[PDB]
Structure formats: C-alpha cells, structure tokens
Design a protein around this nucleic acid. Structure first.
Ligand SMILES: Nc1ncnc2c1ncn2[C@@H]1O[C@H](COP(=O)(O)OP(=O)(O)OP(=O)(O)O)[C@@H](O)[C@H]1O
Ligand SMILES: Nc1ncnc2c1ncn2[C@@H]1O[C@H](COP(=O)(O)OP(=O)(O)OP(=O)(O)O)[C@@H](O)[C@H]1O
Ligand SMILES: Nc1ncnc2c1ncn2[C@@H]1O[C@H](COP(=O)(O)OP(=O)(O)O)[C@@H](O)[C@H]1O
Ligand SMILES: [Mg+2]
Ligand SMILES: [Mg+2]
Ligand SMILES: [Mg+2]
Lengths: 68, 193, 54, 321, 298
DNA sequence: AGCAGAT
DNA sequence: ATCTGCTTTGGGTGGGTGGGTGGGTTGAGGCAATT
C-alpha cells in the first residue's frame, strides 16, 4: 500500500461545530425540492459551483485524458 | 452474438431474469465483454422458428435485437444524467480547454479540492485518492525489468469517518471501477476463475 | 459408579423373556421352565460382566 | 380397494357421563401404565383450544405444544404413535431423519415428468392436526429455525427457485426428547440436560419430565403390568370421530367468572417469587388449556371447573419442570 | 370525496400527533415509548442524493431489547401485517441466502445465480428481524453495507453485482444475560459491536416489573382480548384510517428552516460533549431524519 | 428398404 | 401405375445459429457453502 491514511474521530468543540455546519448545509443543498432542460442544467451548475471549483463531468473527462 | 440478461439491479427481488439475444455486426464486435452491464439500442425483429413451434405447440416466433449502438453502463450508476454513448470522451474543444485549466498555477490543489466535495475535511484522504486516480507511469527497463505504475491506498479509520462514501465517489469517477465488500468477495471472484 | 455399562430398563425385561422363549423353543416344550429363564439370566450376565471383571 | 343421528346420540350419551375425563384419558393409550397426567395433557392437546380470527388485532393460535422428555427407558415413542393413530390429521417424523418426508416445504424436480414441483413438508401437511416429532434433540439448525418460524408465525415462507410463496402450517406439535448422557440428572436444570435453546423449550405449553427413578414399588408394578400383558375403554374409531366432531363444531367462550379465576391464578403464580416464577406465556397456556377442557365436555362455555383443571395441569407441569 | 373529508378532519385535529401514537398496535398494552418509534419509522425520512452522486440515507432503523415475554415479537408482527412491503425473519435464518444474498448454481453447466435474502426481499419496505443477537457472522459483517450504503456487493466466481437493499430494519434482541441488568450500560447488556450500534437510530429497552398492580392490569387486558374479542380494542383511528394518513404524510418533503439549522448544530455539540463512544457523525443525521419524520406526522 | 411426391 | 428421392437406427464417418422438458450417465476437478 503506497499511502496509509489513518482517520481518527476526536471530540473538539470547534471541529464538531464546523463539521455539523457543513453537514447540515449539505443536507439542505441536496434536498429534492430545493428551456426546461436548460433551466435544470443551470440550477444544477449553480448548486455544484458552491463546493467544487471544477465541474465533476469536466473533471472525469480531464482525468481520463490525462491517464490516456 | 451475445446473450443479454436482465441486470440483477433491475430484476424484481427473488424472481428469475429474462434474456434476449443481440446480434452485433461489423464495427460493434468485442465492444462488450462478459460480465458487463450495457445499454443496447437496436431493432426488435422476429422470424420463424420450427423448433419453437414444435415445443410450444403454437405458432410462436423467435425474437432478437439487431444492435445499433452500445453504451457501457458498468460502474456508472451515478452518471445516468449524461448524453453520448461514452461519458469520458472529449471533443476537440474540450481538450483545448483541459489545457487552459491546467496551465493555471494551482491546479494540483483545485483538483484535490474537487475530490468528493460533499465530504467536509480529510485533505490527506482526498490527496491520496487524487494521486491514485491519476496514477503513475509503468516502465519496462530494456524489456527485462517490469515496474508497477499504479498507486494503492488504504483507509484505516474510525466508524463514522466517511470512508465508504469516498470509495463510492471513486467508483463514480474512475473510468473502470468495481466495488467489492469484505465477505461478499471470494478468492476467485477477484482475479479469475 | 462409572464402570456399569448401563442401568437395567424394561427393555432388559423384554429381552430376558425373549431369550427364555427362544430357549423353550429349543427345548420344544410349551411350558417355559425356570431353567430356561435361569440360563438366559446367566447368558446376559456373562455377556458383559464375565469379561469386564477380568 | 382392500356422522349420523345415531352417532350424534351416542356422542351425547358419552358426553353426559360424569366420569368422562378419566374415561377419555384411559382410552387414549390403554397399554401405557400410570401416566395419568401425561395422558390428560395429550387428550387436551388433541382437542385443541379455540382459534381466534381477529380484526384490529393479530391472530391468536389455539394449538397446544407438548414436549415429552425424560429417560430412554420410559415409554415416549409409544405415546407419539398412539397420538398419530388417534389424530384426524397429522404426520410422524424424526429430526435428522431421511425416511421422513421433511419438515419444511422444499422445491424439487419430478423424476417421472422432469418438472419442478413445490412439495410441502410434514409441518404443512399437519395443518389442523398434530405433528409428532420423535427425536427433537438431534436437529439441523436450519430445521430448528423453520420450527421457530412455525411455532411463532404458524406459516412457512420459501422464496427460492423463482417462487415466493407462503404456506399455512397451523399444526400442533408433540415432540419427545432424551438426555445428553445415559440418564437424566435431577441436580442439573432441565435446560442443561435437554440440550435445547431456552428460546425453544420456552414455547411449549406443557413440558413433562417423565423420569425412571428406581423404586421397588414402581418397578414391581411396571413389571407386573408388562408380564400380565403377555374401567371401560373406547374403540379408536369412536375416539377419533368424537374428537373430529368436537373440533369441528364446538367453540367454547370465556365468561366473567372464568375471567376472574384466570386473573387471580396468574397473579398468584406471579406472586410466588427476584426470581420470576411465571410469565405472560403461562396465561396463554392456561386459557388455551381451559378452552380445550371445555371442548372435551362439548360445552360451549368455559366454567370455573375448566380454568381450575387447566391451572392444575399447568401448575403441575411448571412443578416438576 | 368522502375519504378526503376524513383526511382534512384528521389534520385539523390538534391532538393528532398523540392520537396516531396511541393507535399503533392496539393489541399491545402500555408501551407508548416504543410505539412512537414505530410510527416515525413508517413515515421515514427524506431520501437525498448530493450534487455528485453520493447518497444520504433516509430510513430509520430501530432496535428493541427486553426480557423474555415482553411483547417484543408482538411489535414486529403488527408491522409486517400492516406495512405495505415487509418481511418477517429471524437472526438464525434457515435459507442459504440469510439476511443478504447468496450465489447458488444448478447442477453441472448451469452458471451461478443470485438467491435473494431477507434484506433484498424487503426492498423499499421494513425488514423485521426477530432475534438480531443471533445472526451469522457472514450476515453480521454483510449487514454493515446494507444498513448505510443501502446495497449488497457480491463478487463471487463468475458473478458480480450490487443489489439494492433500501430497507428499514426493525430488530428485536435479548439481553446477553438472562435478563436486562440495570447496573450495566446498554453496551454491556448487548452483544452488538460499536459500528452496528451506531447504525441504529433509536434504542428501546423493555423491562419486566413484578408490581402486583401492573401484573393484574396486564393479566386483565390479555384475558379481555379473548373474552370481548374486537370489543376490547377501540383505538382512536382504525387500521384503514391510519394507513391512509401515513400514505398522505409521505408525500410531504419538509425542509429545514434557518432557525432550526443553527439550533440543530448546537444540540449535536451538546450530545458530543456529553459523550466524551456512542455518538458519531451518524447521530447528527439521525436527528435530521427523526426531525423530518416528526414533521411528516404533523 | 419404406414411404412421400411429380409426370 | 411407375419413376425419383430422403432417412434412420441412435451416435460422434451430422453437428453445436436447435438445445437439454428429445435420450444417449460415470469420472474428475473447481467452487461456494458448510463445517
Ligand atoms: N408403561 C411403561 N412405562 C415404562 N416403560 C414402558 C412402559 N410400557 C412400555 N415400556 C417400555 O418402553 C418401550 C417403548 O418405549 P421406547 O423404547 O420408544 O422408549 P423411549 O423413551 O420413547 O425412547 P428410546 O427409543 O430412546 O428408548 C417398550 O418396549 C417397553 O420396553
Ligand atoms: N405489554 C403487553 N401488552 C399486551 N400483551 C402482552 C404484553 N406483554 C406480553 N403480552 C402477551 O404476551 C404473549 C407472549 O409474549 P411474546 O412471546 O409475544 O413476547 P416476546 O417479547 O416477543 O418474547 P420472546 O422475548 O421470548 O421472543 C403475547 O401474545 C402478548 O399477548
Ligand atoms: N467529514 C465528513 N463530511 C461529511 N459527511 C460525513 C463526514 N464524516 C461522516 N459523514 C457522514 O457519514 C455518513 C457515511 O458514513 P460511512 O463513511 O458510510 O461510515 P464508514 O466510515 O463506517 O463507512 C454520510 O452520510 C456522511 O454524510
Ligand atoms: Mg463503511
Ligand atoms: Mg424412543
Ligand atoms: Mg418474541
């Protein structure tokens, strides 16, 4: 195994504060309720931009191109 | 000719799966391989079969599909919201920009950020996952020495620390991925039988 | 004690009477003599105890 | 190949008899000696308690499960054979026995026709009857799982070979058990000797410990009876017809006096103990046994005597067990 | 038209939340704490998937622990006979598949085939396991992924697949000892391990008391069940009424308000602080699930 | 070789 | 009425785009589940 990543769960009040805030904001973001196809794509893009600097589909194509 | 069978995911639980036969003419041969999910577009055709009539006792015909295209659905359950028969292919304009994104100075770290963004922290895990996804370069020195060129990662953590979610994301993003669980895998299930 | 093969049961009574009946059949007499029962008892005793005590 | 008004009148005439209970008990298995309590319990089991179809509530089983466990010397397969003979519906089986048809529904292939056929096992074929399992001790774990599902849900569910089906198995059980060693040790508890899970031997309505304690008088009497084998009794046909008539027509119901006596007896059996002497299972056992005793008299109502007889058998069963 | 009027009359009630809880499994007696959990499990939570294909669970898993003869199974029996899709099983499952799927191959040439288990058959339903504490090691391990990722991954000779197991588990277990011991903690009394225990949203413990008053009251009710038959059970809402409202509630997809968002973070902080290992990041999502379920009931 | 068909 | 022509048994001197609910059935070797 080239890389070993050990993960620990330690109760730090500030660390718990940030993680809970992020998780609740994510659950709010993923809620289903929150041209027609063009509008759907635009809203999905706006939602995605908030947490990922690069689009996921563009990232998949980029990784494949780099590996090829 | 290939024998298509209902995917276990779609067949109702506990029932037997139906199957059909697909005919792949030139340029479509060997695109699909055994044990893989696929999305076949073709023509539903029927012809006369004497043996089928003899066994059933009624004049029932035999039906087949004449493939017109194939899309590899394996390991892409989370990419169903995408056009084209290949979702990991590029136009001549999308690779004239994969080359602007990449001259910028911090791509090596905007790439690490874009790994499973719905997971809060774990920067080391995301870095390892990105490294494994891009992988090293295999090399055969003089045709005598073989050196591996891929990176293996192990996540050894506590219960609720977003490991399985990272594995699922890597399954989504990789070109060819297979997911296996501890006791659901066998010695010959992995490798070959 | 632990030496005993197994405590006697009604099966043993049925076996004893069965052996006595077979012995009487050999004797060719209807009336089952006490001698046949005694011989059957000796046979059951020597079946196991005779060699176990050795 | 090698019921009538008169039958009904004869049945009423026997029912009106003051000494009906001991009469049926004796007639069940004449050749057995001095096992009155066991015979009485088995007689109650044959009739079976009332079955309840409930709206706004789950189904409540009227069956009685009895475990006949003790030393190998005593007569236990005899009683199972007798019960099989009497029962209007039932099967005979031994756990881990290839000869028996099988306790669970299983998918097979017809050799004659080369087709797949779903074959019901012994438990399903005992629907409405008594399924006597001779060797309860030696059983496959899967068999002990299907038995748990039957005694709990009273149905067997099979979902293999493309088929998803459920089969009714509303059958009573009368099993027999033997000790781990060559004899039953009174010092150790029943559970250790029986070699059955507590979850399993907790489900029998009555557990009978028939032990062959060596006594001069008892051995004398048993030997005298056996050798002599070389109080009226009823023919088996009459007994089975009577049982079928009662089981098909009579449906006894509980009353306020019976409701008072049941509550009082359960409370008394709880207060005896901290050690838990009795559980809510004993209440269901008592009500079922009272219903069966009412059925045997062909009565449509459960009186104080029925509940009192049921407690006497249950308390005695809790007694040596 | 008539049924709709009934539905409106139901929602307008102000006791509605209490009435539904008191109308679950009327056969049992005096276990309102458990009944609230079962009702919330039927309504469930909102199922969400992130903007990158990561799935967040929306099913509530409940475990019930108690001494023998404490109506544990009576709760499972009601659910299977009431819930749309459900499957009653036991930890020591007889079939080869068990709680999860297994591969079985017919004689000679026949290739391997998947035989569904309990968790697969109860897809989109509720899977009731009668004795959780007796499960097999293969299923004990295999239940890890089913409860959280909602899939069963199998890679055997010639066959590999991911099988959907989107089910809510309602389990019943016995104490490690003969009876639940009040001195030890829930961890000590149970044979389950920490990773599983964190996968259950709720835990309920049912004890056995020897009080004379409670004993007489319980005995009376059981006998009246057989005596009066239907007349002994008069829940506020009949089975048909309750099943209709539950279907109506599940069409609601409540969201989290601004005030609740900040509030929900503070409560997790308090829960974590008191722990310092029951509480993990999962308990934060459990409160989101239960909050949605409670909202659906209203 | 017996039976199935075309001139 | 006469002339022209195909196909068996059962078996590999028909085969595996005919299959194994159309019969040719022991022997060995690999795999999952059971232990
Ligand atoms: N009334 C009786 N009391 C005790 N034993 C009896 C009685 N009547 C018969 N027996 C004996 O019991 C034998 C029949 O019982 P059986 O051999 O089936 O015993 P079991 O305890 O059921 O089982 P096992 O086969 O392990 O001995 C008869 O052959 C006779 O030996
Ligand atoms: N609180 C209660 N309310 C109503 N009935 C009860 C109650 N407690 C026990 N009972 C009665 O007890 C009978 C037997 O209990 P049951 O076997 O269902 O309990 P359990 O907890 O599932 O058992 P076990 O733990 O042994 O599996 C049930 O039929 C039920 O009628
Ligand atoms: N750092 C994190 N950021 C976001 N979500 C997290 C994080 N850690 C845990 N989670 C939550 O935990 C759940 C997944 O737990 P999982 O990784 O399956 O447990 P395990 O690590 O045992 O596989 C997800 O719903 C996820 O939202
Ligand atoms: Mg995991
Ligand atoms: Mg016997
Ligand atoms: Mg139970």
């Amino acid at each position: 195994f080239d890389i070993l990543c050990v993960v620990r769960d330690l109760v730090d009040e500030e660390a718990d504060e940030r993680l809970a805030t992020f998780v609740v904001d994510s659950h709010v973001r993923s809620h289903p309720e929150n041209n027609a196809r063009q509008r759907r794509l635009q809203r999905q893009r706006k939602k995605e931009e908030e947490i990922s600097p690069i689009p996921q589909e563009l990232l998949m194509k980029y990784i494949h191109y780099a590996r090829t | 000719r290939v024998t298509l069978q209902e995917a276990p995911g779609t067949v109702p639980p506990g029932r037997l799966p139906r199957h059909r036969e697909v005919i792949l003419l030139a340029d479509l041969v060997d695109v699909s391989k055994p044990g893989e999910e696929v999305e076949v577009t073709g023509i539903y055709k029927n012809n006369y079969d004497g043996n089928l009539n003899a066994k059933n006792g009624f004049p029932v015909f035999a039906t087949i599909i004449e493939a017109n295209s194939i899309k590899r659905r394996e390991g892409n359950t989370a990419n169903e919201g995408e056009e084209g028969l290949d979702v990991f292919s590029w136009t001549e304009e999308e690779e004239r920009e994969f080359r602007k994104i990449s001259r910028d100075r911090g791509i090596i770290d905007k790439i690490i950020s874009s790994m499973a963004p719905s997971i809060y922290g774990h920067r080391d895990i995301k870095t390892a996952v990105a490294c494994s996804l891009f992988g090293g370069v295999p090399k055969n020195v003089n045709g005598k020495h073989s050196i591996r060129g891929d990176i293996n990662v192990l996540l050894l953590g506590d219960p609720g620390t977003a490991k399985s979610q990272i594995l699922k994301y890597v399954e989504k993003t990789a070109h060819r991925a297979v997911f296996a669980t501890g006791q659901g895998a066998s010695a010959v299930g992995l490798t070959a039988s | 004690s632990k030496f005993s093969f197994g405590q006697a049961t009604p099966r043993t009574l049925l076996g004893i009477i069965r052996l006595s009946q077979a012995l009487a059949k050999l004797r060719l007499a209807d009336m089952v003599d006490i001698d046949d029962v005694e011989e059957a008892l000796r046979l059951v005793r020597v079946s196991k105890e005779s060699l176990y005590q050795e | 190949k090698v019921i009538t008004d008169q039958d009904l009148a004869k049945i009423r005439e026997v029912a009106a008899r003051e000494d009906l209970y001991s009469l049926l008990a004796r007639s069940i298995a004449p050749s057995i000696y001095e096992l009155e309590d066991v015979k009485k319990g088995i007689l109650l089991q044959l009739f079976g308690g009332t079955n309840k179809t409930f709206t706004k509530g789950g189904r409540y089983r009227g069956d009685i499960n009895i475990l006949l466990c003790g030393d190998p010397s005593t007569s236990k397969s005899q009683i199972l054979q007798y019960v099989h003979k009497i029962t209007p519906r039932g099967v005979y089986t031994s756990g881990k026995g290839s000869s028996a048809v099988g306790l669970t529904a299983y998918i097979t292939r017809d050799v004659d026709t080369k087709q797949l056929v779903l074959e019901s096992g012994a438990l399903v074929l005992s629907d409405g009857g008594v399924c006597c399992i001779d060797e309860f001790d030696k059983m496959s774990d899967s068999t002990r799982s299907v038995l748990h599902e039957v005694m709990e849900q009273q149905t067997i569910s099979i979902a293999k070979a493309g088929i998803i089906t459920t089969l009714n198995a509303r059958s009573s059980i009368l099993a027999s058990a033997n000790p781990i060693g060559s004899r039953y040790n009174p010092n150790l508890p029943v559970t250790e000797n029986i070699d059955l899970p507590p979850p399993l031997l907790s489900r029998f309505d009555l557990v009978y410990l028939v032990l062959d304690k060596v006594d001069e008088k008892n051995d004398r009497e048993l030997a005298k009876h056996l050798t002599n084998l070389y109080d009226d009794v009823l023919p088996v046909e009459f007994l089975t017809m009577y049982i079928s008539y009662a089981k098909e027509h009579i449906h006894p119901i509980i009353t306020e006096a019976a409701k008072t006596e049941l509550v009082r007896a359960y409370v008394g059996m709880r207060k005896m103990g901290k050690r838990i002497t009795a559980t809510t299972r004993q209440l269901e056992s008592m009500i079922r046994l009272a219903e069966a005793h009412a059925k045997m008299k062909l009565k449509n109502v459960v009186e104080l005597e029925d509940v009192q007889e049921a407690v006497r058998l249950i308390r005695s069963a809790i007694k040596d067990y | 038209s008539d049924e709709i009027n009934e539905l409106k009359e139901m929602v307008k009630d102000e006791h509605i939340y209490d009435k539904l809880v008191r109308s679950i499994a009327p056969a049992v007696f005096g276990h309102e704490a458990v009944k609230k959990g079962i009702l919330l499990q039927m309504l469930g939570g909102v199922h969400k998937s992130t903007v990158e294909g990561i799935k967040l669970r929306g099913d509530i898993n409940i475990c019930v622990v108690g001494d023998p003869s404490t109506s544990k199974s009576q709760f499972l029996k009601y659910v299977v006979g009431f819930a749309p899709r459900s499957v009653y099983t036991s930890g020591k499952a007889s079939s080869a598949a068990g709680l999860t799927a297994a591969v079985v191959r017919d004689e000679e040439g026949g290739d391997y085939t998947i035989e569904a288990g309990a968790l697969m058959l109860a897809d989109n339903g509720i899977c009731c396991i009668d004795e959780f504490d007796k499960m097999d090691i293969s299923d004990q391990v295999a239940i890890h992924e089913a409860m959280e990722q909602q899939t069963i991954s199998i890679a055997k000779a010639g066959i590999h697949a991911t099988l959907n197991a989107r089910t809510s588990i309602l389990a019943a277990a016995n104490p490690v000892g003969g009876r639940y011991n009040r001195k030890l903690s829930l961890r000590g009394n149970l044979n389950m391990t920490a990773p599983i225990m964190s996968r259950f949203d709720l835990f309920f413990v049912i004890l056995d008391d020897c009080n004379e008053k409670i004993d007489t009251e319980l005995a009376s009710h059981i006998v009246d069940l057989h005596m009066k038959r239907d007349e002994a059970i008069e829940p506020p809402f009949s089975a048909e009424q309750l099943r209709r409202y539950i279907k109506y509630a599940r069409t609601f997809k409540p969201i989290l308000t601004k005030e609740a968002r900040s509030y929900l973070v503070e409560k997790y902080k308090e829960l974590r602080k008191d722990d310092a290992y029951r509480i993990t990041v999962r308990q934060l999502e459990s409160m989101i699930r239960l909050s949605e379920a409670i909202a659906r009931a209203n």
